[PDB]
């Protein structure tokens, strides 16, 4: 499969671009799809800076702490769940995702958040191909970032219980 799609599809045609020069730029400036969430978070975060005595705290500091918080909350999840549910036994049989509604809802909420952040990174492409305003896409992402995760949580909880029934 890798050989086929490396022969038939084109990826990163560096010659259509040029050598790097600090004075010129283009319109699509995205990274590969595993950093798009970082880019989208930088795009849809509001401009909140702090200026106090002889100093300045810019906006991308926020991106830094949020990124670090994500990277710290990922490895420390099993200990959080065992502290919250209070279950410390050995387990060798897996669970079906429909038997654990709360964890499934948490995971669906996190995936929805990630998808919102990733789609907020291709603002230009979306607004150009699909005829939408650019400011509209920015605000859509900025509001979805708050109202989509809980909606997904609610629907996923109810869906899991429906499957159980």
């Amino acid at each position: 499969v890798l050989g086929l799609m490396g022969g038939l599809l084109q990826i990163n045609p560096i010659w259509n671009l040029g050598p790097y020069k600090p004075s010129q730029v283009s319109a699509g400036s995205q990274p590969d799809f595993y950093m798009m969430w970082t880019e989208g978070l930088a795009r849809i975060w509001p401009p909140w800076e702090f200026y106090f005595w002889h100093h300045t705290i810019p906006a991308p500091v926020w991106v830094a702490v949020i990124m670090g918080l994500v990277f710290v909350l990922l490895p420390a999840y099993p200990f959080l769940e065992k502290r919250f549910t209070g279950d410390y036994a050995h387990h060798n049989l897996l669970q079906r995702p429909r038997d654990v509604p709360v964890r499934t809802a948490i995971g669906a909420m996190a995936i929805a958040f990630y998808m919102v952040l990733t789609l907020a990174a291709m603002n230009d492409i979306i607004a150009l191909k699909f005829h939408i305003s650019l400011n509209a896409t920015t605000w859509i992402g900025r509001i979805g970032m708050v109202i989509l995760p809980p909606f997904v949580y609610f629907i996923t909880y109810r869906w899991c219980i429906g499957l159980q029934r």
Binding site: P22, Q24, V25, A42, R43, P46, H54, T56, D124
Partner: protein
């Protein structure tokens, strides 16, 4: 170069009232958020657009940001002409150019 028709909607930031030579203004090209070239200039909205994360600065209001995570205005350069008719710089920027850091802008 600003059209002679408008030339009445300019606001002229507090310390740079004489940094323009007629209808020429000469702002910097390094975006004040993370340093990409803010080169997209819309001629009859007078808006400068940074293509990296889509900030928007108001070329008629001392390059004040009016959209996005950008929070500080673009720096302006003073210009004039010399005794032969060429455009020269009339000094230096009044402040650092580019992204901000702990010390100052």
């Amino acid at each position: 170069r600003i059209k002679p028709s408008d030339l009445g909607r300019v606001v002229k930031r507090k310390g740079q009232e004489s940094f323009n030579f007629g209808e020429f203004f000469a702002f910097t090209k390094v975006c004040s958020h993370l340093g990409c070239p803010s080169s997209l200039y819309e001629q009859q909205s007078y808006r400068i657009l940074c293509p990296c994360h889509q900030s928007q600065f108001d070329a008629l209001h001392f390059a004040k940001p009016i959209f996005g995570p950008a929070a500080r205005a673009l720096a302006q350069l003073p210009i004039t002409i010399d005794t032969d008719g060429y455009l020269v710089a009339n000094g230096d920027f009044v402040e650092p150019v580019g992204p901000a850091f702990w010390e100052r802008t």
